[PDB]
């Protein structure tokens, strides 16, 4: 809606924002994935100290 | 902004001044005192010789012939005021093209200026078309073709008109510079045809400059206004606008093309 | 709607009226009373002087020559009715272009309608180009070809019509100076030349109006039938468009030479 | 099927029949009885007056002058059978173009027909180029440009030739319609120049039509055959084919542009 | 190979022979004289380099072949770059149009000269008989003037067109779309050569007519 | 570098020498070489500074035309390079390059061809000179000398006019194109429009020159 110039500005803004949003989502997700790896490594540290059968199950 | 005819006209004017007008001015100035004294002393000498020895008609023929020679030489030496006439031509173009037939109040603009403004309107519309072509990466070269069409129409109209204005100005400068040689050609009967031909060409290019000034100003202002209204919004038909542009351009180009023949024909029609 | 030739013609008519017709009317009206009285007093004075002086034949020479001068001056000053003639030229163009050869009951109208049909086809081609983002510039080229053909045909015809109208207006304005040329024998050639040019541009205007109307109507109908559907061959349609355009263009090109040639052929 | 020149020729022929031929026929029909009786009564009256007082050469000059006027008026008024002469031209075109120089027998057809067939071959090649452009979505506009060049070459050639044929036909129709007035010009010595000029123009446009019929038919048939052999297969060089098309088109166009001057020059060369 | 002017010239020559020459005969010496005056002059009058033997159509065909081959190379490059390749298509179109327009102008004026000379030779005997009677002398005068006009035409186009077309052919034969030649320079040289040759040729016909008029006849 | 008019002019000059001039010299011997060198060198002298104003050191007509055309073609090549950068959305720059190239080529070709025509005609007339100088021996053949002199004057005026005007115009065009840049500070439409306007203005001015030369030659009685 609106004048064709407003349409142009809206479309260019959408394009730039879409590219930037893609990049930012990827970056933050990768940070989360690294923290996920740290958590998995922690779970395996617990596996070494397990004593009874109920604990390991 | 678009400024092409103003710098070109100023360049041609400086060239035509510095060579055609300035050479004629300095050459006339250098000989004016010498020729003045020589003509005076020759008049005295011939008067004495005719009153003592030579064939003479004392009061009628000698005085009348001296008067004819003096008036012709005075007029021919009045060419030493060349800058006056060069400014006269360079101001005859804008005064006539400004508001003689346009009917619009004039701030005091000229020829090259108005051609530049109208061509700027056209080229701005072409630039907007190019910008739209840039927006649509693919499916955008249609706007590039639109811009090329607009650019070519505007440029070709402006070029034809301005080039004939330049031709008129250059021709008038050369003729004014060579004027004295052809005004001295009235002294002898065999060389009269030279002055007749020079006068005919002066009339030809004067009529050319008048006609092109007036008609080109009117047509180029109309084209400039039309292109200044053009817009690539959602409300105007692109085909209608581009077609109107090309129609106005071609209509102006052919009308102008008829003008040189008209000027030459009128100059020939006047006897001279 | 598409209105381009009506505003342009009205603008040019206003410029010609204010600057070529009104100025001539203003000059003739200012001189008519003074020149009238001066000519009458000169007639009286010259009659008395010739009957009391230089030899003249009052019964034949004086009355006949005075009658010649009087008729020529009367016609020349009757050119002060410039508005009638300019409106006569303004009425001439549309009355003939409307139905002389069309057969369908202003001229700045038929050219606009035919060009509108052509430019509508070009616009449809541009729209088809817009639909196909890539593989669509072919339709852009089709639209450019249609636009150029329609525009160049219309521009040539209309510009020659404009030349005829401007020239006839200028000649009608400068008329009286040339009707006055019949008074003196040496200046008769000026009237002959003015009459020849008037005949030239009148024949020009007749030929262009008639033939251009016919050709532009044919082109308009052809383009109005053009459609980018699946049942019409695009190459055939565009080729017919360009052929009609070029045929009309060159036919119109021959016409100015014809008008000038007939004007020269009539003695005058 | 492709039908362009048949409808166009029929339309132009109907227009010329309604506006030139029919008006001339009606005008002659309106004057024939009245002029006939008036010419007869005037002859009787002048005979009585010359035998009863006027200057006369009774048997030689009167009979000779009367016979001259009568024969000339009989031919001009007989020009009133215009419908025969218009049909004669419209049939002179196809009879010549059908088999005079083709050699290969054609059962029966018209003339513009051949221009339509050759233009159809060219436009079919252009259409195939456009189809190839459609196949390659991107990297296909090259075929679009090929189709544009083919279309333009064919259209320019056909339009140039057909338009000069149309000019010849229209001019001949107008001259045949105005014939009787200029046949009457023979009667008046001051008005003989009108008949001379009319005859010269008639000869000009008749030579014009002969030359275009012949040469245009030959050139357009050559172009049609060449385009009919053009193919976008893997065995034909596209550059060679398109270049041959443009070369043939331009060669034919420039020849046809030299023909009108030749016709006018021949008409001028014959005294008339 | 590129063979366009040889077949077209043969077609026009055979059409002329069957109609004008054969009807007038029922000449062949003078017809062959014209058809051989074209190649002998165009081959070596102004070229300098001694060609073994060919005809005017042959040389025009070879030069046009060089030009069209460069256009084909540009089209091939356009095909390689699917997108960003239509620039090479435009280059090919420019090359093709320049070559075609030059060759067409030259060959078409050669064709006009040949056709006109053949028609004049066919109609010759009438205008030779025109010398019997004093009133009909002007007919022979005009026929001779036209014969001189078209002979000068054919001489001038043969020589100048052969030279210019050979120059253009050599220039285009050295054109390459490698990494070492500037594309703009090459295409600009092509268009400049083509336009210079066409406008120079456009002046020749007026020269021929002017000389024919200048000689009294 | 761009060198097209220098080799072409040298080729035409060698051809004209070996055919028109050397044959005439040998026939008469059984002093044209000077009159031919003078005709060739008349063009360089006028173009270098007669109306050009800028004091060029030393060059020939072909040299100046080549340099200005090189400026134009370099701008066209830069446009082509920009078109190459933008794979799609780049053919606009290709069209810009085509426009620039065609404008430069059209104007340079029109002036160069008219210069070539003048040189060829003058050399042919100089070669045929003696046959028309001998025409003054007999009264009926005086008209041949009159016509030859008129044509000599025609083509001399032609060569002078094209030298001067073409050099001025072509140098103006060359400077303008040499300032053209595809940066972010310059309007592309303005630049291309100025290019086409300058080209067309120069071309139609050059078109009017031959008629002027022929008319002046006719105006002088001869």
User: E-chain residues within 8 Å CB-CB of F117?
Assistant: 200, 203
Tokens for D218, please give them: 């030959």
Cβ of B249 under 8 Å from any chain C Cβ?
Answer: yes
Distance of CA B58 to the CA centre of its chain: 48
Angle (CA) C18-B204-B164 rounded to 5° is: 75
User: B-chain residues within 8 Å CB-CB of A12?
Assistant: 135
Torsion of CA E176, E180, E181, E183, to 10 degrees: 90
Cα D248 to Cα C197, D234, D241, E90, E95: the distances in Å are 42, 23, 11, 21, 17
Tokens for A37, please give them: 């790896």
Name which of D139, D153, D217 to mutate to probe chain E: the one with the most chain E Cβ atoms within 10 A of its Cβ. D139
Name which of B117, B126, B151 to mutate to probe chain F: the one with the most chain F Cβ atoms within 10 A of its Cβ. B151
Nearest Cα residue in chain B from C139: B142
* Residue C252 contacts residue B254 (beta carbons within 8 Å): no
Helices (H), chain F: 5-16, 22-29, 32-49, 61-85, 91-133, 142-161, 167-178, 188-219
> Do residue B160 and residue F95 have CB atoms under 8 angstroms apart?
no
- Return the residue matching tokens 């008006």: D23
Cβ of B266 under 8 Å from any chain C Cβ?
Answer: no
Nearest-neighbour CA in chain A from B150: distance (Å): 21
Work out the number of other CB atoms within 10 angstroms of the CB of residue D66.
14
First CA to last CA distance, chain D: 47
* Residue F110 contacts residue F103 (beta carbons within 8 Å): no
Closest alpha carbon to D231 in D120, D157, D124, D118: D124
> Do residue B103 and residue C19 have CB atoms under 8 angstroms apart?
yes
Tokens for F17, please give them: 């020498």
User: D-chain residues within 8 Å CB-CB of C134?
Assistant: 137-138
Cβ of E78 under 8 Å from any chain D Cβ?
Answer: yes
Nearest-neighbour CA in chain B from C230: distance (Å): 23
Q: Which SS3 state, helix, strand or coil, does residue B125 take? A: helix
> Do residue B240 and residue C123 have CB atoms under 8 angstroms apart?
yes
3-class SS string, chain E = CCCCHHHHHHHHHHHHHHHHHHHHHCCHHHHHHHHHHHHHHHHHCCCCCCCCCCCHHHHHHHHHHHHHHHHHHHHHHHHHCCCCCHHHHHHHHHHHHHHHHHHHHHHHHHHHHHHHHHHHHHHHHHHHHHHHCHHHHHHHHHHHHHHHHHHHHHHHHHHHHHHHHHHHHHHHHCCCCCCCCCHHHHHHHHHHHHHHHHHHHHHHHHHHHHHHHHCCC
What is d(CA F142, CA F135) in angstroms, rounded to the nearest whole number? 6
Torsion of CA B32, B37, B40, B45, to 10 degrees: -140
Tokens for C106, please give them: 């202003």
3-class SS string, E145-200 = HHHHHHHHHHHHHHHHHHHHHHHHHHHHHCCCCCCCCCHHHHHHHHHHHHHHHHHH
Cβ of B157 under 8 Å from any chain F Cβ?
Answer: no
**φ/ψ (deg, to 5) at C57:** -100, 95
Nearest Cα residue in chain F from E84: F87
Cβ of B261 under 8 Å from any chain F Cβ?
Answer: no
Cβ of B12 under 8 Å from any chain F Cβ?
Answer: no
Closest alpha carbon to E88 in D128, D239, F177, F108: D239
DSSP code for D18: I
What is d(CA F201, CA F166) in angstroms, rounded to the nearest whole number? 12
Work out the number of other CB atoms within 10 angstroms of the CB of residue F153.
17
Nearest-neighbour CA in chain B from C59: distance (Å): 37
Nearest Cα residue in chain C from D138: C135
Evaluate whether chains F and E are touching (3 or more beta carbon pairs less than 8 Å apart). yes
Nearest-neighbour CA in chain E from D81: distance (Å): 35
Q: Let me know how long chain B is.
A: 272
User: A-chain residues within 8 Å CB-CB of B233?
Assistant: 3-4
Nearest-neighbour CA in chain C from B210: distance (Å): 15
* Residue F100 contacts residue E204 (beta carbons within 8 Å): no
Work out the number of other CB atoms within 10 angstroms of the CB of residue F85.
10
Tokens for C30, please give them: 């200012």
What is d(CA D115, CA D103) in angstroms, rounded to the nearest whole number? 17
Cβ of F87 under 8 Å from any chain B Cβ?
Answer: no
Q: Kindly list the partner chains of chain E, i.e. chains with 3 or more CB atom pairs below 8 Å.
A: D, F
> Do residue A4 and residue B135 have CB atoms under 8 angstroms apart?
no
- Facing residue for C137 by CB, picked from B142, B242, B269: B142
User: A-chain residues within 8 Å CB-CB of B234?
Assistant: 3-4
Nearest-neighbour CA in chain B from C57: distance (Å): 35
What is d(CA E126, CA B76) in angstroms, rounded to the nearest whole number? 64
User: C-chain residues within 8 Å CB-CB of D197?
Assistant: 265
Residues 13-52 of C with CB under 8 A from B: 14-15, 18-20
What is d(CA B76, CA C237) in angstroms, rounded to the nearest whole number? 68
Nearest-neighbour CA in chain C from D29: distance (Å): 22
User: E-chain residues within 8 Å CB-CB of D222?
Assistant: 8, 11
What is d(CA B241, CA B150) in angstroms, rounded to the nearest whole number? 10
> Do residue F84 and residue E84 have CB atoms under 8 angstroms apart?
yes
Contacts 24+ apart (CB under 8 A), B134-137: B134/F89, B134/F92, B135/A8, B135/A12, B136/F89, B137/F88, B137/F89
Cβ of D224 under 8 Å from any chain C Cβ?
Answer: no
> Do residue C15 and residue B145 have CB atoms under 8 angstroms apart?
no
- Facing residue for D140 by CB, picked from C135, C242, C254: C135
Tokens for F131, please give them: 């046959």
Helices (H), C52-109: 63-78, 82-99
Tokens for F58, please give them: 């030393």
DSSP code for A35: H
* Residue E99 contacts residue E4 (beta carbons within 8 Å): no
> Do residue C135 and residue D130 have CB atoms under 8 angstroms apart?
no
Cβ of C101 under 8 Å from any chain D Cβ?
Answer: yes
* Residue B24 contacts residue B82 (beta carbons within 8 Å): yes
Q: Kindly list the partner chains of chain B, i.e. chains with 3 or more CB atom pairs below 8 Å.
A: A, C, F
- Facing residue for F69 by CB, picked from E48, E188, E214: E188
What is d(CA B43, CA B64) in angstroms, rounded to the nearest whole number? 12
What is d(CA F127, CA F25) in angstroms, rounded to the nearest whole number? 8
User: D-chain residues within 8 Å CB-CB of C218?
Assistant: 8, 11
What is d(CA F74, CA F100) in angstroms, rounded to the nearest whole number? 10
What is d(CA C51, CA E103) in angstroms, rounded to the nearest whole number? 84
Q: How many contacts (CB atoms, under 8 Å) link D and E?
A: 90
Closest alpha carbon to E34 in E6, E5, E13, E3: E13
> Do residue F193 and residue B140 have CB atoms under 8 angstroms apart?
no
* Residue E156 contacts residue F73 (beta carbons within 8 Å): no
Nearest-neighbour CA in chain D from C138: distance (Å): 6
């Amino acid at each position: 809606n609106g004048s064709v110039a407003d349409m142009r500005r809206s479309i260019e803004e959408r394009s730039r924002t879409a590219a930037a949003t893609d990049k930012a989502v990827g970056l933050r997700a990768y940070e989360g994935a690294q923290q996920r790896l740290a958590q998995i490594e922690g779970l395996m540290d617990e596996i070494s100290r397990t004593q009874d059968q109920k604990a390991i199950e | 902004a678009f400024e092409l005819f103003t710098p070109l006209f100023n360049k041609i004017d400086q060239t035509t001044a510095t060579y055609v007008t300035d050479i004629s001015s300095r050459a006339i100035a250098a000989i004016t005192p010498v020729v003045s004294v020589g003509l005076t002393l020759g008049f005295i000498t011939y008067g004495w010789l005719i009153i003592r020895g030579a064939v003479e008609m004392p009061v009628a023929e000698f005085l009348n012939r001296c008067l004819r020679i003096g008036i012709i030489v005075s007029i021919a030496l009045a060419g030493g005021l060349y800058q006056g006439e060069i400014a006269n031509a360079i101001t005859t173009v804008p005064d006539e093209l400004a508001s003689a037939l346009l009917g619009n109040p004039t701030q005091g603009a000229s020829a090259a200026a108005l051609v530049d403004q109208s061509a700027q309107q056209g080229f701005d519309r072409a630039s907007e078309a190019f910008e739209e072509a840039g927006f649509f990466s693919s499916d955008g070269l249609l706007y590039g073709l639109f811009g090329i069409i607009i650019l070519l129409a505007t440029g070709l109209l402006a070029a034809i008109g301005g080039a004939f204005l330049l031709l008129a100005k250059i021709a008038l400068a050369l003729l004014a510079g060579l004027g004295p040689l052809f005004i001295l050609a009235l002294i002898w009967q065999p060389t009269h045809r030279f002055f007749d031909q020079w006068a005919q060409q002066v009339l030809n290019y004067g009529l050319l400059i008048v006609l092109f000034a007036a008609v080109f100003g009117l047509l180029m202002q109309i084209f400039g206004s039309y292109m200044a209204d053009l817009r690539f919004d959602g409300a105007q038909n692109v085909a209608y606008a581009i077609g109107g542009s090309v129609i106005l351009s071609i209509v102006s180009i052919v009308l102008l093309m008829q003008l040189p023949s008209i000027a030459s024909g009128l100059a020939g029609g006047i006897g001279l």
